[PDB]
Ligand binder design. Structure first.
Ligand SMILES: Cc1cc(N)cc(O)c1
Length: 237
């Protein structure tokens, strides 16, 4: 179907058309991550400007499936722009102990009332479920700590759950952000979604959960447990 803001808000469980404020941005970001799972399982059958936005919208919103970073963050960029925000696309290199290709991960920045926020509803692993300030200052979300440090002309998103040291998530160059950047974008299954107070992630057989900053992981053995976790992730919340 054709892109429709109202249909999209309904799909992620947001009522009405809330105003273009920081509180609205936080709510949209968290609802999107809870309702729209990351899922690369059929990413090959949809491969950036040469993929019409309506095809991705149809797959994710109209049909209710998940997607990957250059699908979910591309749709969310469009939604935020239609809702009145100053939104900019930026590419990142993912901590793979080394950082991978320099434009592997695509996400968004929003500039609002003199502050810049990171927006990412399309990263598979444990990462922030509400937008981060673009700041080295430490920020706290559901018991996890976050900061955006500066190292060697890169900003680096770092995360610290309970019982852990600081972990880099990905790194990016803020000055390469682009309001129109989506028009320029060039074997294991990853599936995840946010919960009310954390995130659940399945990579191959490896099941990861974080709740109030407390992490648990298990390599799944049984087929019925595997099926149950897939259903739990893909059902949304
Ligand atoms: C670690 C990872 C990051 C991204 N952006 C995509 C993937 O399939 C895996």
């Amino acid at each position: 179907h054709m892109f429709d803001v109202a249909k999209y808000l309904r799909r992620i469980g947001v009522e009405g058309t809330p105003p273009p404020t920081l509180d609205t941005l936080r709510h949209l970001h968290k609802r999107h991550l809870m309702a729209v799972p990351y899922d690369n399982s059929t990413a090959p059958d949809r491969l950036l400007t040469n993929v019409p936005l309506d095809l991705v919208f149809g797959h994710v919103v109209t049909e209710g499936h998940g997607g990957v970073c250059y699908e979910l963050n591309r749709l969310f960029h469009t939604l935020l722009a239609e809702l009145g925000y100053d939104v900019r696309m930026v590419a990142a290199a993912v901590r793979q102990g080394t950082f991978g290709p320099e434009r592997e991960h695509t996400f968004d920045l929003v500039h609002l009332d003199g502050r810049t926020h990171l927006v990412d509803v399309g990263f598979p692993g444990p990462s922030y479920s509400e937008p981060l300030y673009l700041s080295e200052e430490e920020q706290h979300q559901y018991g996890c700590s976050y900061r955006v440090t500066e190292h060697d002309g890169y900003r680096v998103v770092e995360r610290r759950p309970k019982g852990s040291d600081w972990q880099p998530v990905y790194r990016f160059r803020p000055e390469l952000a682009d309001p129109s950047g989506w028009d320029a974008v060039r074997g294991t299954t990853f599936r995840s979604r946010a919960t009310d107070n954390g995130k659940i992630v399945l990579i191959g057989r490896r099941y990861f959960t974080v709740e109030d900053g407390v992490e648990r992981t298990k390599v799944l053995v049984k087929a019925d447990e595997f099926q149950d976790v897939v259903d739990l992730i893909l059902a949304g919340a």
